Write an enzyme that holds these catalytic residues in place. Structure first.
Site, PDB file in Angstrom:
ATOM      1  N   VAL A 273       5.443  -0.623   2.756  1.00 18.50           N
ATOM      2  CA  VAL A 273       6.159  -0.071   1.580  1.00 18.50           C
ATOM      3  C   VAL A 273       7.420   0.754   2.017  1.00 18.50           C
ATOM      4  O   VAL A 273       8.393   0.879   1.280  1.00 18.50           O
ATOM      5  CB  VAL A 273       5.213   0.802   0.673  1.00 18.50           C
ATOM      6  CG1 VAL A 273       4.830   2.116   1.434  1.00 18.50           C
ATOM      7  CG2 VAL A 273       5.857   1.030  -0.736  1.00 18.50           C
TER       8      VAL A 273
ATOM      9  N   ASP B   4      15.342  -3.082  11.801  1.00 19.10           N
ATOM     10  CA  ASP B   4      15.572  -1.628  11.701  1.00 19.10           C
ATOM     11  C   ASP B   4      16.961  -1.436  12.275  1.00 19.10           C
ATOM     12  O   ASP B   4      17.129  -1.388  13.516  1.00 19.10           O
ATOM     13  CB  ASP B   4      14.524  -0.918  12.529  1.00 19.10           C
ATOM     14  CG  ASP B   4      14.654   0.619  12.464  1.00 19.10           C
ATOM     15  OD1 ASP B   4      15.739   1.132  12.111  1.00 19.10           O
ATOM     16  OD2 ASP B   4      13.632   1.256  12.703  1.00 19.10           O
TER      17      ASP B   4
ATOM     18  N   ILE C  44      -0.108   5.092  -0.051  1.00 17.55           N
ATOM     19  CA  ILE C  44      -1.152   6.123   0.010  1.00 17.55           C
ATOM     20  C   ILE C  44      -0.506   7.420   0.445  1.00 17.55           C
ATOM     21  O   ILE C  44       0.401   7.443   1.309  1.00 17.55           O
ATOM     22  CB  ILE C  44      -2.253   5.713   1.058  1.00 17.55           C
ATOM     23  CG1 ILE C  44      -2.842   4.335   0.713  1.00 17.55           C
ATOM     24  CG2 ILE C  44      -3.388   6.822   1.218  1.00 17.55           C
ATOM     25  CD1 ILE C  44      -3.369   4.224  -0.642  1.00 17.55           C
TER      26      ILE C  44
ATOM     27  N   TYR D 277       3.364   8.124   1.023  1.00 15.51           N
ATOM     28  CA  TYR D 277       4.053   6.813   0.945  1.00 15.51           C
ATOM     29  C   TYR D 277       4.384   6.364  -0.425  1.00 15.51           C
ATOM     30  O   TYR D 277       5.229   5.461  -0.591  1.00 15.51           O
ATOM     31  CB  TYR D 277       3.360   5.761   1.732  1.00 15.51           C
ATOM     32  CG  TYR D 277       3.613   5.932   3.210  1.00 15.51           C
ATOM     33  CD1 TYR D 277       4.442   5.068   3.901  1.00 15.51           C
ATOM     34  CD2 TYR D 277       2.957   6.959   3.932  1.00 15.51           C
ATOM     35  CE1 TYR D 277       4.672   5.220   5.308  1.00 15.51           C
ATOM     36  CE2 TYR D 277       3.157   7.120   5.325  1.00 15.51           C
ATOM     37  CZ  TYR D 277       4.029   6.227   6.001  1.00 15.51           C
ATOM     38  OH  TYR D 277       4.207   6.381   7.370  1.00 15.51           O
TER      39      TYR D 277
ATOM     40  N   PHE E  29       0.845  -1.198   0.000  1.00 14.83           N
ATOM     41  CA  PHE E  29       0.000   0.000   0.000  1.00 14.83           C
ATOM     42  C   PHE E  29       0.867   1.229   0.000  1.00 14.83           C
ATOM     43  O   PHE E  29       1.827   1.336   0.782  1.00 14.83           O
ATOM     44  CB  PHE E  29      -0.960   0.013   1.212  1.00 14.83           C
ATOM     45  CG  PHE E  29      -2.081  -0.963   1.066  1.00 14.83           C
ATOM     46  CD1 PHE E  29      -1.843  -2.324   1.172  1.00 14.83           C
ATOM     47  CD2 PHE E  29      -3.392  -0.513   0.793  1.00 14.83           C
ATOM     48  CE1 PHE E  29      -2.858  -3.223   0.986  1.00 14.83           C
ATOM     49  CE2 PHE E  29      -4.424  -1.419   0.568  1.00 14.83           C
ATOM     50  CZ  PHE E  29      -4.155  -2.756   0.679  1.00 14.83           C
TER      51      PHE E  29
ATOM     52  N   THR F 212       3.132  -5.838  23.515  1.00 17.17           N
ATOM     53  CA  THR F 212       2.123  -4.793  23.392  1.00 17.17           C
ATOM     54  C   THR F 212       0.840  -5.297  22.726  1.00 17.17           C
ATOM     55  O   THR F 212       0.270  -4.654  21.840  1.00 17.17           O
ATOM     56  CB  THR F 212       2.660  -3.550  22.684  1.00 17.17           C
ATOM     57  OG1 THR F 212       3.092  -3.909  21.353  1.00 17.17           O
ATOM     58  CG2 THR F 212       3.839  -2.959  23.473  1.00 17.17           C
TER      59      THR F 212
ATOM     60  N   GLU G  72      -2.291  -4.736  13.513  1.00 19.23           N
ATOM     61  CA  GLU G  72      -1.273  -5.580  14.095  1.00 19.23           C
ATOM     62  C   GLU G  72      -1.798  -6.280  15.334  1.00 19.23           C
ATOM     63  O   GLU G  72      -1.347  -7.380  15.620  1.00 19.23           O
ATOM     64  CB  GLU G  72      -0.063  -4.730  14.455  1.00 19.23           C
ATOM     65  CG  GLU G  72       1.120  -5.466  15.254  1.00 19.23           C
ATOM     66  CD  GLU G  72       2.406  -4.629  15.318  1.00 19.23           C
ATOM     67  OE1 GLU G  72       2.635  -3.986  16.379  1.00 19.23           O
ATOM     68  OE2 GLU G  72       3.197  -4.620  14.323  1.00 19.23           O
TER      69      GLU G  72
HETATM   70  O1  LIG Z   1      -0.272   7.701   5.086  1.00 12.79           O
HETATM   71  C1  LIG Z   1      -0.071   6.484   4.998  1.00 12.79           C
HETATM   72  C2  LIG Z   1       0.016   5.704   6.163  1.00 12.79           C
HETATM   73  C3  LIG Z   1       0.276   4.323   6.026  1.00 12.79           C
HETATM   74  N1  LIG Z   1       0.448   3.688   4.750  1.00 12.79           N
HETATM   75  C4  LIG Z   1       0.713   2.245   4.597  1.00 12.79           C
HETATM   76  O2  LIG Z   1       0.633   1.670   5.932  1.00 12.79           O
HETATM   77  C5  LIG Z   1       1.881   1.043   6.211  1.00 12.79           C
HETATM   78  C6  LIG Z   1       1.980   1.000   7.760  1.00 12.79           C
HETATM   79  O3  LIG Z   1       2.026   2.272   8.323  1.00 12.79           O
HETATM   80  P1  LIG Z   1       3.431   2.909   8.697  1.00 12.79           P
HETATM   81  O4  LIG Z   1       4.529   2.229   7.923  1.00 12.79           O
HETATM   82  O5  LIG Z   1       3.258   4.346   8.623  1.00 12.79           O
HETATM   83  O6  LIG Z   1       3.502   2.489  10.243  1.00 12.79           O
HETATM   84  P2  LIG Z   1       4.874   2.072  11.001  1.00 12.79           P
HETATM   85  O7  LIG Z   1       5.609   0.980  10.375  1.00 12.79           O
HETATM   86  O8  LIG Z   1       5.795   3.396  11.143  1.00 12.79           O
HETATM   87  O9  LIG Z   1       4.446   1.719  12.502  1.00 12.79           O
HETATM   88  C7  LIG Z   1       2.889   1.882   5.395  1.00 12.79           C
HETATM   89  O10 LIG Z   1       4.024   1.101   5.074  1.00 12.79           O
HETATM   90  C8  LIG Z   1       2.164   2.052   4.085  1.00 12.79           C
HETATM   91  O11 LIG Z   1       2.329   0.822   3.404  1.00 12.79           O
HETATM   92  C9  LIG Z   1       0.366   4.430   3.564  1.00 12.79           C
HETATM   93  O12 LIG Z   1       0.516   3.840   2.467  1.00 12.79           O
HETATM   94  N2  LIG Z   1       0.108   5.856   3.694  1.00 12.79           N
HETATM   95  O1  LIG Z   2       4.731  -2.110  20.166  1.00 13.91           O
HETATM   96  C1  LIG Z   2       4.264  -2.286  18.843  1.00 13.91           C
HETATM   97  C2  LIG Z   2       4.787  -1.118  17.983  1.00 13.91           C
HETATM   98  O2  LIG Z   2       6.180  -1.132  18.019  1.00 13.91           O
HETATM   99  C3  LIG Z   2       6.802  -0.065  17.306  1.00 13.91           C
HETATM  100  O3  LIG Z   2       8.200  -0.182  17.360  1.00 13.91           O
HETATM  101  C4  LIG Z   2       6.430  -0.096  15.836  1.00 13.91           C
HETATM  102  O4  LIG Z   2       7.015   0.993  15.184  1.00 13.91           O
HETATM  103  C5  LIG Z   2       4.924   0.032  15.765  1.00 13.91           C
HETATM  104  O5  LIG Z   2       4.544   0.106  14.425  1.00 13.91           O
HETATM  105  C6  LIG Z   2       4.267  -1.125  16.544  1.00 13.91           C
HETATM  106  O6  LIG Z   2       4.565  -2.349  15.928  1.00 13.91           O
END
Ligand SMILES: O=c1ccn([C@@H]2O[C@H](COP(=O)(O)OP(=O)(O)O)[C@@H](O)[C@H]2O)c(=O)[nH]1
Ligand SMILES: OC[C@H]1O[C@@H](O)[C@H](O)[C@@H](O)[C@H]1O
Ligand SMILES: [Mn+2]
Length: 275
Positions: A140, A254, A62, A65, A60, A173, A231
């Site tokens: 993504v 990461d 959006i 992104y 995705f 969590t 999640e």
């Molecule tokens: O404005 C947005 C927010 C989220 N995403 C999709 O949702 C995924 C998960 O959200 P994000 O990566 O922002 O969360 P994180 O990994 O930082 O917790 C992103 O990889 C994108 O694939 C997107 O496409 N546009």
């Molecule tokens: O505790 C769960 C959370 O942990 C963060 O490190 C991660 O960036 C979040 O996207 C979520 O998975």
């Protein structure tokens, strides 16, 4: 029906020498945990190539992104299922912002315009059964840095969250309010799985995403939103429907946040720095 492997020459596995002694390589429901040194990729490539396997990858992109797609797709080209048939499915609100990335032979990309919501969208149900054998659903904002191949494929898999693979279950969590469908108590839980990389056969992924979408609807109806959104639901599903393989944090890392510990021999699929 599965034809015979051809003759192959490789090192004899040795019963009385473990591949890896430092980590758990099988869950207590006898699902492999995939770490480097547990698989011979040549044997696995032959098995999957012999079935003419096709792998769908969904992503995705959006709003902002869409900027992550070029590096994501170019690095997937170098590292993801090379040698096998791949169908990328890019869901986006900006079809004209998807970069033109050169693909290897047997690889295709479909742009799907769209108007937590990933679970509903993924669960497309008719199209996926007709075009791919497995679906892999990832974030993504990532790049592939090393081999991500057919060693992951199985009816249903989750990936250990890189922040929690050393943690006791009380520290996970999970959603802890009994009022949520995603609720898990402190004395339950095998692993903490990250929402950013899961997959399986089409049928199993559609089942999962259908279940998570119905559980999210119930929660919404009830005025509650799980602590970590999709999640949280992914984790409840995989607690109650055990995955047939679990991917180690090599598959979702990461390096900026967590470095390169000795237990990770390869960092295969990693977060991209983002403001
Ligand atoms: O404005 C947005 C927010 C989220 N995403 C999709 O949702 C995924 C998960 O959200 P994000 O990566 O922002 O969360 P994180 O990994 O930082 O917790 C992103 O990889 C994108 O694939 C997107 O496409 N546009
Ligand atoms: O505790 C769960 C959370 O942990 C963060 O490190 C991660 O960036 C979040 O996207 C979520 O998975
Ligand atoms: Mn992400």
């Amino acid at each position: 029906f599965m034809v015979s492997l051809p003759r192959m020459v490789y090192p004899q596995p040795k019963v009385l020498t473990p591949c890896r002694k430092d980590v758990l390589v099988v869950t207590p429901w006898l699902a492999p945990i995939v770490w480097e040194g547990t698989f011979n990729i040549d044997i696995l490539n032959e098995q999957f190539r012999l079935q003419n396997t096709t792998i769908g990858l969904t992503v995705f992109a959006i709003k902002k992104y869409v900027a992550f797609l070029k590096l994501f797709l170019e690095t997937a080209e170098k590292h993801f299922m090379v040698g096998h048939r791949v169908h990328y499915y890019v869901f986006t609100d900006q079809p004209a912002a998807v970069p033109r990335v050169t693909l290897g032979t047997g690889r295709q990309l479909s742009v799907l315009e769209v108007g937590m919501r990933r679970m509903e969208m993924i669960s497309c149900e008719r199209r996926f059964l007709s075009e791919v054998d497995y679906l892999v659903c990832v974030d993504v904002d990532m790049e592939f840095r090393d081999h991500v191949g057919v060693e992951i494929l199985t009816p249903l898999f989750g990936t250990l969250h890189p922040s929690f693979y050393g943690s006791s279950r009380e520290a996970f969590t999970y959603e802890r309010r009994p009022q949520s469908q995603a609720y898990i108590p402190k004395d339950e839980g095998d692993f903490y799985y990250m929402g950013a990389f899961f997959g399986g056969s089409v049928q199993e992924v559609q089942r999962l995403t259908r279940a998570c979408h119905q559980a999210m609807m119930v929660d919404q109806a009830n005025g509650i939103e799980a602590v970590w959104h999709d999640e949280s639901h992914l984790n409840k599903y995989l607690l109650r429907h055990k995955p047939t393989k679990v991917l180690s944090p090599e598959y979702l890392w990461d390096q900026q946040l967590l470095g390169w510990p000795a237990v990770l021999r390869k960092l295969r699929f990693t977060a991209v720095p983002k403001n």
